[PDB]
Amino acid sequence: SISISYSTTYSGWTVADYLADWSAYFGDVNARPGQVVDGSNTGGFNPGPFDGSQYALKSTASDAAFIAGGDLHYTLFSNPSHTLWGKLDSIALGDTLTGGASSGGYALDSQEVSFSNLGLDSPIAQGRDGTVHKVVYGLMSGDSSALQGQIDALLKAVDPSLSINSTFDQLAAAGVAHAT
Amino acid sequence: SISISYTYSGWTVADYLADWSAYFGDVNARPGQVVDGSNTGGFNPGPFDGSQYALKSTASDAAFIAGGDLHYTLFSNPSHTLWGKLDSIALGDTLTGGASSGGYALDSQEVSFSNLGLDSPIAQGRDGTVHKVVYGLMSGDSSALQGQIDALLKAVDPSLSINSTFDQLAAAGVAHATPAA
Ligand code: HEM
Ligand code: HEM
Numbered sequence: 001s002i003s004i005s006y007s008t009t010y011s012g013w014t015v016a017d018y019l020a021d022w023s024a025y026f027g028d029v030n031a032r033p034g035q036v037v038d039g040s041n042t043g044g045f046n047p048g049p050f051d052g053s054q055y056a057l058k059s060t061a062s063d064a065a066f067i068a069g070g071d072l073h074y075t076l077f078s079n080p081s082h083t084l085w086g087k088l089d090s091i092a093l094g095d096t097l098t099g100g101a102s103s104g105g106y107a108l109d110s111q112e113v114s115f116s117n118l119g120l121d122s123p124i125a126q127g128r129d130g131t132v133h134k135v136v137y138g139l140m141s142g143d144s145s146a147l148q149g150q151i152d153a154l155l156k157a158v159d160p161s162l163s164i165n166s167t168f169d170q171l172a173a174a175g176v177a178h179a180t
Numbered sequence: 181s182i183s184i185s186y187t188y189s190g191w192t193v194a195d196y197l198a199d200w201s202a203y204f205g206d207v208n209a210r211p212g213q214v215v216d217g218s219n220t221g222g223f224n225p226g227p228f229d230g231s232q233y234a235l236k237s238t239a240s241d242a243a244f245i246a247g248g249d250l251h252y253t254l255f256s257n258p259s260h261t262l263w264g265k266l267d268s269i270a271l272g273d274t275l276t277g278g279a280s281s282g283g284y285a286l287d288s289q290e291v292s293f294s295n296l297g298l299d300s301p302i303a304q305g306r307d308g309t310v311h312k313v314v315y316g317l318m319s320g321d322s323s324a325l326q327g328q329i330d331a332l333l334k335a336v337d338p339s340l341s342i343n344s345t346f347d348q349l350a351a352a353g354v355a356h357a358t359p360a361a
Binding site for chain 2: 041042043044048049050057060076077078140141
């Protein structure tokens with residue numbers, strides 16, 4: 001079962017509303033006026049250089065960031081070239097990357113929403129057509145549409161009445177979300 | 181002006197760069213050689229900017245260091261442009277070290293093209309000169325590199341070219357010697 005944690009800041013928001021906000025902020029700091037862009041520029045694979053238990057990336061337009069967690073691998077120039085594949089267990093979205101290999105992994109300074117126990121598994125054989133690829137490739141430019149479709153399918157698997165249009169409080173009522 | 185360093189006394193610039201891109205193209209090019217290279221790569225300290233950009237090869241270990249103030253734009257317009265201060269193209273064979281060591285350095289530094297004065301703005305994009313240099317060398321193609329060296333040693337000496345011996349440039353006060361091991 002997908003498990004979701006969300007800050008109380010978004011208690012009344014739909015999933016699809018929050019992802020639109022995070023994507024807007026990724027594209028433009030002025031989507032959240034008041035914020036300074038000063039996150040120490042880190043990110044990459046942990047441990048890397050091309051495989052890890054996490055892949056993390058922060059916008060350069062803002063300190064919006066994401067952390068993909070699982071068992072991930074990237075092919076570079078090897079056939080299926082430029083494919084991200086493996087197991088995608090979770091996607092955490094928020095503000096500013098901290099940590100890295102030497103602290104036990106990347107974390108977010110402000111973790112806003114986190115989607116976990118995802119069970120996504122894409123094999124190398126599907127190349128860049130794989131789901132894990134599409135999800136994390138979208139997020140690298142702040143495009144949360146591939147992630148959004150996947151959160152939808154997984155919620156409907158828990159309950160065909162839950163969707164990216166359910167608010168986090170409703171998902172919490174459903175036993176799927178947990179407020180933080 | 182330019183400064184090179186160099187086993188490579190009789191070689192021309194076009195000669196050494198023909199062999200390296202060959203060994204970068206595959207390990208077949210330098211028979212005897214094997215590959216154990218601890219699979220590095222990246223910006224120092226990165227993710228997308230650094231004082232060095234080291235990149236090992238996949239087929240062999242022929243590998244280059246880019247030295248200076250370098251930047252990669254990713255999705256920032258102009259997208260997927262590497263630009264910045266390209267002050268040296270090291271060109272050794274193995275690309276050891278790291279960011280958390282003191283900088284990248286090849287264990288067998290072969291030829292350091294060392295003061296190139298290449299400086300490209302971001303506004304130029306993929307048409308910039310520092311891009312076409314470093315991206316060429318991403319895959320072996322050292323044509324763009326050689327062209328900029330050709331126009332650089334010609335300001336010091338018009339009769340001198342890239343098809344000239346390595347000692348010819350060192351005897352004129354442009355390069356010195358770095359041994360073998
Ligand atoms: C983290 C370290 C990474 C490095 C060093 C890297 C490097 C590169 C380079 C150098 C290219 C252009 C190569 C060329 O066309 O000559 C490229 C292309 C590409 N990369 Fe990566 N990449 C990385 C991570 C990723 C990740 C995580 C993804 C996907 C989630 C990704 C997806 C792609 C895609 C889709 C292309 C386009 C290839 C094409 O259009 O032919 N990259 N990458
Ligand atoms: C350092 C980490 C890097 C990452 C994460 C990365 C990632 C990517 C990605 C995701 C794409 C495809 C974007 C898309 O499909 O719309 C791409 C394309 C590209 N990358 Fe990068 N890259 C990296 C390093 C480099 C470097 C060092 C160079 C050049 C020296 C480079 C050159 C290119 C080029 C030229 C393209 C476009 C090729 C084309 O459109 O035909 N990349 N890269």
